[PDB]
Design a protein around this ligand. Structure first.
Ligand SMILES: [Mg+2]
Ligand SMILES: [Mg+2]
Ligand SMILES: [Mg+2]
Ligand SMILES: [Mg+2]
Ligand SMILES: [Mg+2]
Lengths: 176, 128, 199, 138, 109, 50
RNA sequence: CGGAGCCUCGGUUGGCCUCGGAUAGCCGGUCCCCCGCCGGGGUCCGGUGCGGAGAGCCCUUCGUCCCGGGAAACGGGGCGGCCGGAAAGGGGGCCGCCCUCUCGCCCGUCACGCACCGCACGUUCGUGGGGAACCUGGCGCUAAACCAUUCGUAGACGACC
RNA sequence: AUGAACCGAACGCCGGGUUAAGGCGCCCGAUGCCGACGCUCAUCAGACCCCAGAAAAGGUGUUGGUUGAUAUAGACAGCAG
């Protein structure tokens, strides 16, 4: 799997095929994040195969729908637990992000994990994502934004749109 | 392109000049004519493709062009000589067009002037 | 029709690429005050790289070896040449189109210098990074005309300062004239204001 | 020093992006390079917006960082931001820029004719002032 | 009584890194540097004007030494406003970095 | 292989272009640096070896 | 210095005649202020997504004809003097002249200019660079190098003194 | 870049369009996107399978993570008894 663009949160349920041994196999539900449902179901089967004695052929999907953010207009702090493979040995991580949507926080988690640890998407597997209150937040990089009277300027405005005035006589100003 | 609009001729000998548009001929060409007193433009045919149309129009719904001029009338015959009827029709249509355009301030001078491209003038950016 | 690019505050390679492409498009580009060209990285690394360039030399006959020019203008000219197919007629023609000078000669001091923001140091470099002046580096490596060029630059800057003072007083007189004549040019002003040329 | 500060309750002009050219009031700051914004009186929905596409102005209206769009409209209309923006010099030259882009061909000729005479009048007034300065000097 | 054609620079042929097709030419029209602005110039008539040694016939006037190679503008080329043009005869390589007139009578406004 | 016994190089490369001089009379490459404090005086002369 | 043509070479299709310089700060006025060979600093006032804006500025080319209104009367065109330029020197400014005008620009009236009958390289910087005499008149010009010979501070021959 | 074996893909002579692998500062067609998120100071930086060069060990350079501690009963410093 590759985290192409913003990920989407998928709710997927699956169960084994009915068998003469047991008529009703239990139904298992998982929360996953993937570019589309086609790879989402593949990820679900990968996790279920790794967890229980269920396989793609021995089981079947039931419902693979997309879970929308309940409050996409409220900024929320998300604590994300990770289990990824490094160059030698695997590690468990807890990282705090700050985003409007759970899927966006997961996408940002994939981006910065790959940036900081070279941990690619196939190496990273997500285990638990939840909304965490500011009091329960622990990482200072996220706690610093928890200020009612927050106020900061934009110090250095790097000149974008360089090539439109490409040949000009004016030295650009970075103070506004 | 609507009757009573202003056109810019780009190809013929009267290139770069602003002309008043009358109507569409039966041959598909545009029957255009400017005040000959202004920009020396007779009753002349022109092609729709080869003409730029600007967003400046006058209401000529109250004028009556002669109905005896058609594609055969403007068809080339075979040194060129001007017939008396051409002058008569040109005066007849000028007597109805020129007073109308003179209502709009600074319109006669605009028609007398020509169209040209200077430095930094780009047709895609400019809107006419 | 001829570009005059000020070399002050421009990154070496970043400016060279734009100049080389513009010249290959057929333009005539002249770069002025090459001693003000900045180079990214610390000054020691930049001079160390150029010292390595000096060491690289044909062994059997140094006369045929690489021609290490010490003047900032010729250093910039060489780095632009590296971005062109100078082995071909079009590449040599482009090099002929390009003219590079140290300082601001009288043929170009009376004109207005252009600045390319796409290669400006304060735009393409973080404020916390270190940079090296091409003129200082050239003097360190063997340029023999930093002082005389500096004196000439000082003299023309003083003369341009006097010219700018006269330009200022002309502008002030113009605005005083506009304020005194607005009564009889009002009809020639509102038209521009309604068409977005004087607001 | 600085005079414009990104704080809860400041409006900002948008240069590029989806809603370019429409003022939006920042409600809360999400991250270092992203903040929640909402323009209730200019038809801009509450959404995330990076700082690099918004130019903060010197207009601040007071409301809590979690207030709903209902209050933001109330604060915006009571502060009368729209008329203040219409009156500021910034929007005046923005609108003048739009006017000169909207300029037709016929009126462009009219402006060219008008500006020619205007330059002539200004130039002769300048030179008749210069000779007065010269005779005053000597 | 002035110029009635846009200015263009003959950048080069429609070429790959190691191959070039001479039937298509790349033109850089002055002023336009983006795809959303190169839409206007599609379908225009592009002409390369050059002089010669001996005289040649000139329509509507005395014969002189000027010759042209007519062509049209096919479609856009890249995000930087570069455009593709096809001429009746392939443009000679002498014209690299030289002015090409883009007419306006193939109008679409 | 290497040179068995190290020896100094014959001749000097500082005068490498050992060619007949283009000009007959020896010309002065650089005069001593001038200083305003000193009085005005000549810095060179021409004679003939006897 | 003060006319018409021929051959060849090509691209070009209005110019911008200038502060320096910062980018976690600038720009323009300003004296009610203090010092200096008008410049610098301090106070104050206007802007700053730069409007004294290269997203910018100037000229703008169809013309002639008559009369009228708006701007100019101090200016437009062309003969003498005064300075400004050295990094690869400015076809700039200033003061008088005998000639000339309300023509030059901005809006109104009048008509005309091969209206070459829809159709392409049109429109220029072009007295462009190089060459041959045709060319009428004016002001100034009658040289040097090489070979040969000698020299011998030099030298295979050239070369050099 | 370069190349008998690598990736795509196999070939009659051509026009139009679109792609694979690989690319889009310049050479050199194409990012002249107002591209997104972070890391990186190198006085030997780094820059794409085969591939053309590096190891064990260490860093109070800098970033993230794990675990165990102590602190308003007033800690780690730091200056004194
Ligand atoms: Mg030895
Ligand atoms: Mg020509
Ligand atoms: Mg394979
Ligand atoms: Mg093909
Ligand atoms: Mg390549």
């Amino acid at each position: 799997m590759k985290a192409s663009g913003t990920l989407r949160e998928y709710k997927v349920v699956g169960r084994c095929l009915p068998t003469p041994k047991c008529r009703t196999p239990p139904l298992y539900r998982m929360r996953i994040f993937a570019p589309n449902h086609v790879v989402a179901k593949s990820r679900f089967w990968y996790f279920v195969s790794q967890l229980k004695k269920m396989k793609k052929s021995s089981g079947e999907i039931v419902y693979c729908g997309q879970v929308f953010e309940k409050s996409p207009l409220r900024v929320k702090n998300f604590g994300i637990w990770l289990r990824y493979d490094s160059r030698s040995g695997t590690h468990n991580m807890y990282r705090e992000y700050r985003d409007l949507t759970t899927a966006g926080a997961v996408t940002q988690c994939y981006r910065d994990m790959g940036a900081r640890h070279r941990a690619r998407a196939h190496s990273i597997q997500i285990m638990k994502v939840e909304e965490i209150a500011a009091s329960k937040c622990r990482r200072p990089a996220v706690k610093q934004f928890h200020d009612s009277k927050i106020k900061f300027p934009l110090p250095h405005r790097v000149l974008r749109r360089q090539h439109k005035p490409r040949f000009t006589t004016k030295r650009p100003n970075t103070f506004f | 392109i609507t009757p009573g609009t202003i056109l810019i001729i780009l190809t013929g000998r009267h290139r770069g000049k602003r002309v008043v548009f009358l109507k569409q001929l039966s041959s598909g060409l545009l029957l255009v004519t400017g005040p000959l007193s202004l920009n020396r433009v007779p009753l002349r045919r022109t092609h729709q493709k080869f003409v730029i149309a600007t967003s400046t129009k006058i209401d000529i719904s109250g004028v009556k062009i002669p109905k005896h001029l058609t594609d055969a009338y403007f068809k080339k015959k075979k040194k060129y000589e001007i017939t008396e009827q051409r002058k008569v029709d040109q005066k007849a249509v000028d007597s109805q067009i020129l007073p109308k355009i003179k209502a709009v301030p600074q319109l006669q001078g605009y028609l007398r002037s020509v169209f040209a491209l200077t430095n930094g003038v780009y047709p895609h950016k400019l809107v006419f | 029709q001829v570009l005059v690019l000020d070399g002050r505050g421009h990154l070496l390679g970043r400016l060279a690429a734009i100049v080389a492409k513009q010249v290959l498009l057929g333009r005539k580009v002249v770069v002025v005050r090459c001693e003000g060209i900045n180079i990214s990285g610390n000054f020691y690394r930049n001079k160390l790289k150029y010292l390595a360039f000096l060491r690289k030399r044909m062994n059997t006959n140094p006369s045929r070896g690489p021609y290490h020019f010490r003047a900032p203008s010729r250093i910039f000219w060489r780095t632009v040449r590296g971005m062109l197919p100078h082995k071909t007629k079009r590449g040599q023609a482009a090099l002929d189109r390009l003219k590079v000078f140290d300082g601001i000669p009288p043929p170009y001091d009376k004109k207005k210098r252009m600045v390319v923001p796409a290669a400006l140091k304060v735009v393409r470099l973080k404020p916390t990074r270190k940079f090296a002046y091409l003129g200082r580096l050239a003097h360190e490596v063997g340029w023999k005309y930093q002082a005389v060029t500096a004196t000439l630059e000082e003299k023309r800057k003083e003369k341009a300062k006097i010219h700018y003072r006269k330009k200022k007083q002309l502008m002030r007189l113009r605005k005083q004239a506009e304020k005194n004549v607005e009564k009889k040019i009002s009809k020639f002003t509102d038209v521009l204001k309604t068409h977005g040329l004087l607001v | 020093v600085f005079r414009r500060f990104v704080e809860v309750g400041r409006v900002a002009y948008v240069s590029f992006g989806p809603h370019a050219g429409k003022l939006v009031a920042i409600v809360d700051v999400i991250d270092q390079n992203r903040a929640l914004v909402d323009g209730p009186c200019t038809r801009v929905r509450r959404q995330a917006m990076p700082f690099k596409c918004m130019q903060l102005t010197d207009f601040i209206l007071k409301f809590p960082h979690s207030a709903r769009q209902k209050y933001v409209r109330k604060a915006w209309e009571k502060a009368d931001i729209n008329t203040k923006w219409a009156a500021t010099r910034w929007a005046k030259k923005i609108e003048a820029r739009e006017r000169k882009a909207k300029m037709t061909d016929f009126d462009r000729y009219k402006v060219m004719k008008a500006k020619k005479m205007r330059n002539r009048i200004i130039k002769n007034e300048v030179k008749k002032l210069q000779r007065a300065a010269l005779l005053k000097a000597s | 009584s002035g110029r009635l054609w846009c200015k263009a620079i003959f950048a080069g042929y429609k070429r790959g890194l190691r191959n070039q097709r001479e039937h298509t030419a790349l033109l850089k029209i002055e002023g336009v540097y983006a795809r959303d602005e190169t839409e206007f110039y599609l379908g225009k008539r592009c002409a390369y004007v050059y002089k010669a040694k001996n005289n040649t016939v000139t329509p509507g006037g005395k014969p002189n030494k000027t010759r042209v190679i007519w062509g049209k503008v096919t479609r856009a080329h890249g995000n930087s406003g570069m455009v593709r043009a096809k001429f009746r005869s392939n443009l000679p390589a002498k014209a690299i970095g030289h002015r090409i007139r883009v007419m306006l009578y193939p109008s679409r406004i | 292989s290497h040179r068995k016994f190290s020896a100094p190089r014959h001749g000097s490369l500082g005068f490498l272009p050992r060619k007949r001089s283009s000009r007959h009379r020896g010309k002065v490459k650089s005069f001593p640096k001038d200083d305003p404090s000193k009085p005005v005086h000549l810095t060179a002369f021409l004679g003939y070896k006897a």
